Amino acid sequence: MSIVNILSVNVLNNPAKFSDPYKFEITFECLEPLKSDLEWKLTYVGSATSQSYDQILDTLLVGPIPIGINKFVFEADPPNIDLLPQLSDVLGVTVILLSCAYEDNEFVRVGYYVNNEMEGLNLQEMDDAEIKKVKVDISKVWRSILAEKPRVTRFNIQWDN
């Protein structure tokens, strides 16, 4: 029986510049006292279905956890563009995963699609080879998290049983 339940997630700065930190306002309930802290993570997934072009963006240990309703803002570092094969990879649809673990075991994951567009570029009118050659100016790239369409996955964990 799940001790911690996420009730809502609101992105506070959306759309935003690619390089802006992510601000996730998270409300959850803790039904029973827990021995340990909550481990929050935000992961950048550079392309759904293919390779692991991924980046853990930030983490936050939150605790001790007050019983009842909890609300906080997880402000996560933006992606590191040096961890990407090349700049143009930031463009188009990518994924972000907000997750929480307890004693090292993930118990909830909230995934979002993210549209990424550069000022002045219409991506749909350009062929793939042009996208791999176009000069990307990261300061002109906006992300738009598709925040009304979360994918919520829950994993049974042991908590303090």
Domain boundaries, the chain: 1-161
Structure tokens at 35: 């021995």
Give the sign of the dihedral formed by CA 115, CA 117, CA 123, CA 124.
positive
Q: With the CA atoms of 22, 24, 30 and 35 taken in that order, what torsion angle do they form, in degrees rounded to the nearest 10?
A: 10
Residue 74 burial class via C-beta count within 10 angstroms: exposed 0-12, middle 13-18, buried 19 and up:
buried
User: Residue 123, SS3?
Assistant: helix
Bridge partners (DSSP) of residue 100 are 40, 108
Bridge partners (DSSP) of residue 24 are 11, 74
Strand pairing report for 22-30 and 151-154: unpaired
Cβ neighbors of 18 (< 8 A, separation 6 or more) are: 78, 79, 90, 116, 138, 141, 142, 143
Rounded Cα distance between 131 and 87, Å, is 10
Rounded Cα distance between 141 and 90, Å, is 8
Residue 131's H or E segment, with its range, is helix 128-131
1-161: what fold?
A: Immunoglobulin-like (2.60.40)
